[model samples]
Target chain A: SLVLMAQATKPEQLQQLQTTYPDWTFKDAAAVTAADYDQIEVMYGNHPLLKTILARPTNQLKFVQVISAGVDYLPLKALQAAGVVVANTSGIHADAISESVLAAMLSVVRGYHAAWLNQRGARQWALPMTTSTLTGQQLLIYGTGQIGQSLAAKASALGMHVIGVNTTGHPADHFHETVAFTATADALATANFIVNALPLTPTTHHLFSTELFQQTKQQPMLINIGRGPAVDTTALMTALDHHQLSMAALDVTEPEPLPTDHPLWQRDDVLITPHISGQIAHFRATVFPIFAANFAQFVKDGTLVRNQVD
Target chain B: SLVLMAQATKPEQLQQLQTTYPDWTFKDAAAVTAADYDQIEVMYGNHPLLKTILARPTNQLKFVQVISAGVDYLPLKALQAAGVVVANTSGIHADAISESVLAAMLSVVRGYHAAWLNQRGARQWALPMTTSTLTGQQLLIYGTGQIGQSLAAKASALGMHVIGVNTTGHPADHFHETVAFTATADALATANFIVNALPLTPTTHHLFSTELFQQTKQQPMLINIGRGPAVDTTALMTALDHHQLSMAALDVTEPEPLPTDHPLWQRDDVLITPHISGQIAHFRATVFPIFAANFAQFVKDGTLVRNQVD
Candidate 1:
């Protein structure tokens, strides 16, 4: 039986799902919540409330296939205890995040801001300035996951020194080395560029702080496509005030949709994006195929319907 | 004896030179009305009037050194007849111009327009659209001089498919192929990038225009650090209007100090700048050493000086 558990659906979608999967039974999320249904299909698009319902004590949830590139929300401890199989939405954010890094590097290395300011002014001619180089830059990638691997491939081709960081001692291609240390204390001192792709957790919160800012030798260029609070805005602001930071192309920031009067907007060197590093073309279209595949696998062998909580 | 022909100098600089090169003679531009000077020591800073001072009536000026790279101002016919040896400022502009290209590329790919717009509207949570890929793009260089070669090397390191167009035509290690015979039309269709490092000459004017624009399959990224009119502004605008041009970074432009209200300003892709590509960290410091070495050589061999023109 197929259960689009813990969610509301339009009548048309329900009818369509029934037509598409005639062999399986479809039930409302609430109906399954009562422990009546033994199996359910989960997607990232499913309501956040349902993430808990699928992890309910009453429900013997078999598996879950998350719709994100990262598997941070799989309730690993519970799923492990319940002997539920879990699968992540890997390879989903690859090109999207890769595109963001490309843009960020270009923005910082090119004097786009200065040129725009000159064009808008009443002045006719704009004096040209020498821009920073990406050819020989040292890039410190904060994570060595799938998305970060894409970033390394793109960045290394531009002649940058690509160094990846992770707690795991695994090695990855494109990255010069999968940095084993959890904290980049030594890397921060020499790194000209920093890419934030670390998953959010208690340890990672406010990881990039004021002390690191002071430790930065040259003006630092930062791009954060990861969790927001991982970088301390107060520390970043302090560095900007001292001109220790050159330019920043951040897609994520603490307290995103930062107030209009936010210092980031007013600053000369900083470019703040509203936390969108992984926006790809055809949102549903890209993820839907993966979701459908996982769904089919769930029916075939009862294959532990990946990413399920015990 | 060093004879400064028509080199303009501040009083302080003149005095310093005079004290150092005591045997050297100095003349203001007005004083050098005649060409004949005993054992000429040319330091004229690429002025037509100075070339006239060396080429007119007598034409016995033994050695001529110009301050700029291009010697188009010096009559090739006259120089041949005058037997005045010449050299040019070959290496001076490479570093600065390379920096400019980096800047321009970054600007185009990063999307400064969206960020600039957000300045007025407080707290807009939208992220700039993912920019184009730079590392994997195919680059077709319009010339392969020192500046072009430097840019090509940098681009290659960054994983770009760099191809060079050489008029005199010879293969090079860095360029994928030295396109000796290929017309602008042949290369245009496949080139994702077009960098103009071609010298300014009547034959080269409008080298990149409507024909090239219409032929290219990918978005056109154009940058000219060499000369103005290498790109026909009107044709470029036509391309931009038709959505053929992805970006244009012009350090040099026709009728430089382009009119303030020019329609080009309306373009988010066009970047026009005052021709200042060869200015970087204490530029004079880097240039003067070359001149100083040349001066020492000239004092011994009577070869005039660095970047001398015939």
Candidate 2:
């Protein structure tokens, strides 16, 4: 039996899935019960029943699929211990996230943000604004994942010097240079724009701290399209205040769903987007094929055909 | 004697010119009088004194170099009648203007403009925003000149389907497809973003009117970075009201300096920039070299070496 936990799946898609796998029993989260848990061999997307299934002494859950690229919020350890193979929808979000990153940088450098402010003003014809171009600028992107590589390719085409950061300084496609995480001081110093596309991990947490900001020689703009915990909120504010960073575009915050009274919202230099960089149109149609292909492979050999997250 | 009307020319550059052409007299606009106007063989950049010099029956002006790509503002007919040559600074602003075009489109599509509004609000985490990507969207650009080609290359790199419009539907560099201005009815029907990069002429004035907007079936966002009079304000408003256009980002407005209480400024869908889409960093440094090269060739022959409008 396969459990359908993804709410975005259309009724027609579920019907098609059942037709494809005639021998399998396809049940949604609402239809599944504790008695039927042992029969649940596959699960598509995360749900409230994850912890309950993981708690079962001999959980039959063999495979799990998620719609997000970043699996930080998922119980990776628990899923591993349960011997469940995990697959993520990674490549689907690269275009949307890369577009958002460009949107953040271009908005600031092209005077769109300032022009927007002038739009609500009382006839300010000549704005006191300073605009810059991305051409010939240095962009340092942390994480050489799909999103980072996509952004690098686009930025490079526009005449920017793109550098990628990885754990072991491994080379990445579309980047002019690659540097290890430990040797980023020189890269950070010369960078005009820095982006955190790294996943949330113990090592990545607080990576953007006071020490890192102090090494920045050029005043750079910070953009976070990655997970929130990767950046230190306090250190970010300090960096902006000290002119180590000129501005920040945060799609993710340390404390997700920041309170209405949060001070981050009050600063003119800080732009806050509600963790929506990876949003895509026709989301169900895009991710469904990945899930279906993965499920077909899992049913035969207990391995996903694509997008298996390590 | 040559008239130096360009304010961007540095004292060092003037000294260099004096050294190179010792036989020629170089006089700044401030120092030149009516008597000197007749002696002026060349002029660098446009100035208020142009009308006074043009009115002179015995004017010896052989060439005039303006610091912008457009020659519509100058007295083209009179200059032509007087057998005077004109050169413009064209390719220099391509990178800057292309960046601005990306800024305008990406800002709206990625929800940065709306997120900016949310930042100043009561910290609304769940923003009611519907974001889209430039990838797979159609970008119809008017004019296959430097600015249009530059924008086309950048947009293509970011996964946009770029189509260029010219007088004769001739192929241009960096565009995925090419169409004629008269044959853009099909292109206009499917375009998601439309840009006006065409020069302002009698044939081009009021080109973006209700007639053109009615051809749009995609509710495209119109961007005007070329000239002010190219778009009709009333027709634009009518198109928006009829759902023919989703938005408008105008760097150059019809009135040029749109009034304080202008209705365009108050609209949520219209974005206004004070004619600065082509602004670049270090203005004087960039344009000076072009003028110097053109002047060297103009001295050898009556024709300009580069960027001749006609």
Candidate 3:
């Protein structure tokens, strides 16, 4: 017997969820913490002691919704092992991710110096030189989840080889992968293009460090859209200096809004954006619909809908 | 039986020509014009009114070696009527052209506003912003000759649809279809990328003009590597103003060094370089050998090689 409906705490979201599940109970978990989640109906955003909530479940939670796309923050193993159904703000970011990735790619290709070098005379018109083009290249996307899948599909329509890497790799319409991500040695070596879209887990962190680069067949430019810690910036900096990396375009970084004095800003080879590659101006507008659709599905059936992990 | 190397006047090239055919007598054609020419042996570079020296031979002329890769300047039809054999400079500028095309693509994807944006305060960073990327896209390449073919091959290897356009259609390695340049309306409507590798001639001058842009599907960018005067800058300015074009990354301008204060320099979208895309730091050293070899064949075979019609 459903006594009440547990609605997400977002203001407009709660109202919408209430309308869809009129007969269910609703409560805001906005002020709730792991210490008192037993009194809360649903979770929203994150709290300082999110870890403490995961430390021990108070059973008051039938379903815990995380207000973030990556649920890696919820101590996944604990939730998974406990068999507690977890919901995330997933599909909510697909379009934003798509648009932002385009912005990053465009910014790197059509930079300011390309125009500046032509007008700056007496300094040898060739001093600044030109950067290489990405007209055609093998884009080995390391991740086969929603984010990676969307990027791969669009990348293929634009004439790029959307090669993919996944934990349980399988053939996909858009991607052309010969091997798995574990056997990524040959793939990483000759990959003309690459962008990490994998979620960061203990196993995925620092996955692309200096050791992986030494075996690289060709100097593929690195792109980190997955997780900041997934890439060891120190190793990347050394690679750039040694010309081992042609260029490293970054859209995400740890401890974001990276300090202005961060050494990465000093180098031109490392193209860093303020972790905004997949963050577009109309991001919120694009994500809300997916949430609405998921809510509709949940109303139809008294369980979470479209949960790839569930 | 060879009478004179009509257009061969340069001492460096002349000495080699003489050394090749020691038995034959050499006649200098410095004073000769198209009207005064009897039978001629060979020609190179430009030679006044004898514009098609390699084409309209006086039956005595045996062969001509053009120095340039594109020989559109030499009247192709009339040259065949005279039973004259022709050779063009091949493999001379492969690396240069490849490097230039790559550079053009790089300039388009990498946006400016980098260093300045980093220094901006929170208020400024919050102000409306925009950017672009080039993960995948199709490119419409007009000329499918060596330069076009080479660039297409690179694009295929790199990962872009090389849509080749030409006077007549033919199957190409990387090209989806070799369509007639005039009927390229469909190709233009789909391509996010466009490159002008066609030669500078009366037929092709200002090919990428305002009228042509109407066919562009997605504010596609224009890259000119073939020659100057192949595109109309005034029309380009109009396109940029209307946002019909994303950007113009040029390596060569009609007037060569686009004079100081050229309005193109003012636009953030227009990039004008002193034509250094292909001229790598160590390019001259790389090309001199093949060029010297072409010169050697003229001496060894008693025939001019890699010649173009004047």
Candidate 4:
């Protein structure tokens, strides 16, 4: 039986799925019981039910479809050992997240962040500011996944020098150059802007640290569109204080839904957005098609056709 | 005598100019006097001295070069009648102004404008904002000049449907479509962002009025990187009040150096940048070469070589 954990999917979608795959039984999460969990062959989206389903002794869960692009928070080692296949709604969020990165970079570089302050009580027309153009400026992006690639393509189109960081520096289509994670010391020093789009993993945890910021000869503005823990919060603060980083635009904070009075909120040099970068106008409509295509491919060969997490 | 009014030009640069043209007498603004005014046949950069020189019945001023792209404030009709040719540093500022336009559009669309407010005091991670991408959005740009074409090229690369407005609807290099100013009603309604890059002229003055705003069905953000007088400040305020325009980013404002008590500066939806959009780093180095090239050509022939303000 295939489980639909995403509440956004309509009954008409489920009916269509049932009609398309006659041999498979489609059920909603609310209707599933302990016995049904053991027989669940596939699941769509992340939910509280994951722990219970994963814990079942006779769990038949073979394929999972997550709505988000990042799979870092998932029990990766456990799923790997179980030999279960995973797919993510990766490309679905590319445009939105890439635009967010552009927004962060442009805001800082074009003086909008400071100009907006002038719009408030400051109201000073002679607002002292130093603005730069992304055109011809070096941008170093970590992670060559959908988000990073999308940003690379867009940035390159605007005449920005784009460089991507991946585990092995494997080629990405739009980046002018690619460097391995360990080999980014030189790229970091030359970059005018940096973006973190990598998934949070054991290797990436606290990846943005004082040691990394110290190597930046250019006072680059850092933009985080990835998981919160991908950055070391204290080190980020230190970098800003020490002028290792000129500014930061954070979509995800270390302890998200960051308390009402967090000190991060007080810094004028730091900008924070509450993890809404991938939000789309018709979100359900966009992700539904991705899931449907992956589901069909999974039943045919027990493997996802696109966006496989591995 | 050639007057060099560009303050950023170093003594070494002036010496190079003097060396390059042995017959020409290059005089800095401070060194020029009433005795040299009539003999000043070529001028680089604008100055208050233009009016006095122009009034001289025996004045031999052949060509004038201003470091700014905009020549609206210059007495164009008087200069034309006097048979004085003029050239501006037009293409030199294209990249800077285009980057500013992107900054304004991206800041508003990606929630950076709102997020910055949250940083100042709101401190709400849950900033109530609706963000969108430049990709697939329609951008209507007034004036297919260097700045407009540069922005169109960059915007088109980022997936925006770029349309240009000109006097005759003639094709511009990078625009997806072109419309005449009188034929912009349809384009105005569909545009997600509208940019003013047109020179301030008799037909262009106060071009953005209630009539124009009323046709905007998309409630687009208006960005003025052109002369302030091109847009009616009162009309823009009314448009914002009525939801005809969602926001305004004015790099230039009417009666600029806008009074400290001005109401426009206090609006949360309006951003002011003190006319610094075209300000580039190493501005003198960028503009000097253009003037030098034009001067060299003018000496060979009696015509301005490039960026003639006409």
Which candidate ranks first by lDDT, i.e. highest? 2
**Residue A89 in candidate 1, Cα distance off native in Å:** 17
3 or 4, greater by DockQ: 4
Put down candidate 2 lDDT per residue, A219-303, tens digits, no spaces: 9999998888888899999889988999999999979898878788888888899988988878776677678767866876777
Q: Per-residue CA lDDT of candidate 2, range B107-135, in tens?
A: 99999888987887757886667998886
Query: Which scores better on DockQ, 1 or 2?
Result: 2
Question: Looking at candidate 4, what is the lDDT of residue A131?
Answer: 77
Query: Which 10-residue span in candidate 1 chain A carries the lowest summed lDDT?
Result: A37-46
lDDT of model 4 at residue A54?
Answer: 79
lDDT of 4 by residue, A174-241 (tens): 88789998899878877889999998899899999888999998899999988999899999999999
What DockQ does predicted model 4 obtain? Answer: 0.29
Interface RMSD of 1: 6.4
Best by DockQ: 2
- Note the Cα lDDT for every prediction shown: 0.64, 0.84, 0.58, 0.82
- Go through the candidates in order and give each one's DockQ: 0.16, 0.31, 0.06, 0.29
Better of 1 and 4 by TM-score: 4
lDDT of 1 by residue, A83-174 (tens): 55655545545755775676666555555566666676654464344555454457888888888888887676554567888887478877
TM-score of each: 0.55, 0.65, 0.45, 0.65
Instruction: Report model 4's TM-score to 2 decimal places.
Output: 0.65
TM-scores of chain A across the candidates, in order, are 0.60, 0.63, 0.56, 0.63
- For candidate 4, the docking band is acceptable
**Which residue pairs show collisions in model 2?**
none
In model 2, what lDDT does residue B62 have?
A: 83
